[PDB]
């Protein structure tokens, strides 16, 4: 589109900063189950529906 | 930019308190069959509009370069 | 109704129309968007405020631009003009006539149509006039009517000979075409 509204940019920021895998240092905490980031995303795989 | 035909018009544009800077250019062109003559181009930074003056003679150039004030900042080419 | 310039209306029954007349002037003659008849931008002088008041009359035949209209009640009987129907005798052909005084016209408006005064009831003022259909009807005199037929009689005689012309016709007024 690229005549995109600010709020579209604003939700794109959230997706672009969510889409990182888990920082490794969390892997060693005490009583952690969270091994893989499961709410991770790609752009051709799943739409976000805006 | 704009062009000038009258030097008595010209010589106050260089004194009008907007100018800080101006310049001279020289040009190598040939008249009708003529002979290759240098051609002076006196240009001066009028802030709203650049004013130029095209001159073929060199003695007039030597005249005007000396006639102009010493404080004014000129460059060449 | 994109291009419809204005309703083919009359002036209102003001003091000038009711106790005298007024001179009003045509400026142009224009084809209406989707109408069998033409119209006329025609202008008057508003007598209460300083300006030229535009009006939109229907274009009877014979009328040209650069023309004046003395009009009201004390107007001479001439083509293009208007009167309430009491001052004229029987037989004066008119058009665009009113049902009630000041309704700015219901009857005798369509192209090449007219109506024909035949009678008067001067005491207890009315006026007898036939319709284009021919139904006789007697109406008050104070209501008005413009002299002459609506211009463009014989619009109906020409056939069309192809469907695209009818589509161009009925794109403009109403989607009542193609019909089953």
């Amino acid at each position: 589109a690229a005549q995109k509204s600010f709020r579209i940019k604003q939700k794109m920021a959230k997706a672009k900063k969510q889409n990182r895998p888990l920082p490794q240092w969390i892997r060693l905490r005490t009583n952690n189950t969270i091994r893989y980031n499961a709410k991770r995303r790609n752009w051709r795989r799943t739409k976000m529906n805006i | 930019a704009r062009e000038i035909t009258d030097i008595k018009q010209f010589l106050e544009l260089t004194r009008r308190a907007d100018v800080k800077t101006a310049t001279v250019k020289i040009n190598k062109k040939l008249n009708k069959a003529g002979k290759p003559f240098r051609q002076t181009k006196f240009k001066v930074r009028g802030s709203s509009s650049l004013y130029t003056l095209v001159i073929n003679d060199a003695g007039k150039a030597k005249k005007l370069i000396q006639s102009l004030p010493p404080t004014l900042k000129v460059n060449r080419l | 109704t994109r291009l419809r310039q204005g309703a083919a209306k009359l002036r209102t029954l003001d003091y000038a129309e009711r106790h005298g007349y007024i001179r009003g002037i045509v400026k142009q003659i224009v084809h209406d968007s989707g109408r069998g008849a033409p119209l006329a931008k025609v202008v008057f002088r508003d007598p209460y405020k300083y300006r030229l008041r535009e009006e939109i009359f229907i274009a009877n035949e014979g009328v040209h631009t650069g023309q004046f209209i003395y009009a009201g009640k004390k107007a001479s009987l001439n083509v293009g003009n208007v009167l309430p129907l009491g001052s004229v005798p029987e037989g004066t052909i008119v058009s665009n006539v009113e049902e009630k005084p000041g309704d700015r016209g219901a009857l005798a408006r369509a192209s090449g149509n007219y109506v024909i005064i035949i009678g008067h009831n001067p005491d207890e003022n009315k006026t007898r006039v036939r319709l284009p259909s021919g139904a006789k009807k007697v109406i008050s005199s104070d209501a008005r009517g413009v002299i002459g037929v609506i211009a463009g009689g014989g619009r109906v005689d020409k056939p069309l000979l192809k469907a695209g012309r009818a589509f161009h016709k009925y794109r403009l007024k109403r989607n009542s075409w193609p019909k089953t």
């Binding site: 600010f6 940019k9 604003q10 794109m12 920021a13 959230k14 672009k16 900063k17 | - | -």
Partner: protein, 71 residues
């Protein structure tokens, strides 16, 4: 940003989105004691803002860079 610095007497700054050119032109002028020529601004995709600030002829960029601490 280094190239812009050493080409334009220009600076870069990461900014709060609620601000505009005027506040930026004031704020750097207030803290860091320099005039400016003009400002230009964009919105980084991450939601942040960034502003490209042209100082004037009559100041410099690297001395003030060392003054502020970054390079």
């Amino acid at each position: 940003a280094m190239k812009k610095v050493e080409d334009g007497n220009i600076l870069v700054f990461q900014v709060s989105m609620k601000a505009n050119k005027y506040q930026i032109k004031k704020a750097v002028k207030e803290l860091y004691e320099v005039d400016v020529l003009k400002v230009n601004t964009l919105v980084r995709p991450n939601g942040t803002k960034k502003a490209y600030v042209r100082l004037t002829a009559d100041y410099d960029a690297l001395d003030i860079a060392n003054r502020i601490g970054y390079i």
